[PDB]
Design a protein around this ligand. Structure first.
Ligand SMILES: c1cc(-c2cnc3cnc(-c4cn[nH]c4)cn23)n[nH]1
Length: 249
């Protein structure tokens, strides 16, 4: 029953059980947090950070501990990571996202800061403070709230009053893939005012980060980073992508 607050992780602390020595993460929030707990209660997947419980003393959330830390730290600046590790993390990111979308949940803030790694280096999607329901009773609800982080955010979120939830997450996963591959973020935001975004739209891939990316992965990125959320590739189709299914190492 008794957990020692060993150290601060993120506030968030690592907790080690007094008897077991088991490690768990405790998110400390002094009074969005009611919804974060609700959503956590629905989630069970090996690519999502497991929820253990909560106690209302200041609110305390008990979350799986990931020794590996954030994926952000596995990306070398201006370099990225070896293509096979990227693909592996991407396969796990996809499995995690498929799951969430299956139980009608959208994370809404997918970035390497929120993708934790366990001891086996297995990816876990983390932090559902911005997540919301986009399907209930088999009924889809369009989203209108602006959420996320600007480099990661999809273009429709900027230019449209309402948008579908799933293509938004798919876009951020592609930005994440781009970061793993090139060790850099392509633009500050996906807007025409942004010069870098325009260059991509114009297909100038001889520029960075795209120049650092092999043709097979890049072909997938062309499918993912499509301005029209209706034309954008969907997850079931990412699954059929050649690079996605390319044996690596
Ligand atoms: C930064 C965060 C972490 C880490 C390791 N395990 C966890 C579990 N949950 C979190 C977390 C962070 N925000 N909300 C939950 C961070 N973790 N490591 N480095």
């Amino acid at each position: 029953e008794d957990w020692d607050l060993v150290q601060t992780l993120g506030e968030v602390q690592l907790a080690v059980n007094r008897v077991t020595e088991e490690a768990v993460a405790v998110k400390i929030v002094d009074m969005n947090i009611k919804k974060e707990i609700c959503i956590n209660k629905m989630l069970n997947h090996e690519n999502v950070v497991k929820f253990y419980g909560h106690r209302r003393e200041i609110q305390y959330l008990f979350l799986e501990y990931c020794s590996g830390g954030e994926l952000f730290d596995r990306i070398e600046p201006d370099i990225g990571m070896p293509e096979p590790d990227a693909q592996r993390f991407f396969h796990q990111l996809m499995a995690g996202v498929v799951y969430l979308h299956g139980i009608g949940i959208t994370h809404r803030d997918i970035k390497p800061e929120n993708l934790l790694l366990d001891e086996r280096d297995n990816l876990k999607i983390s932090d559902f403070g911005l997540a919301t329901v986009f399907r209930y009773n088999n009924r889809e609800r369009l989203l209108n709230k602006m959420c996320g982080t600007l480099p990661y955010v999809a273009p429709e979120l900027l230019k449209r009053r309402e948008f579908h939830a799933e293509p938004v997450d798919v876009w951020s996963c592609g930005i994440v893939l781009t970061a793993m591959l090139a060790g850099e973020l392509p633009w500050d935001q996906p807007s025409d005012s942004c010069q870098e975004y325009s260059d991509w739209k114009e297909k100038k891939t001889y520029l960075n980060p795209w120049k650092k990316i092999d043709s097979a992965p890049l072909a997938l990125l062309h499918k993912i980073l499509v301005e029209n959320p209706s034309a954008r590739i969907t997850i079931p189709d990412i699954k059929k992508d050649r690079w996605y299914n390319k044996p690596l190492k």
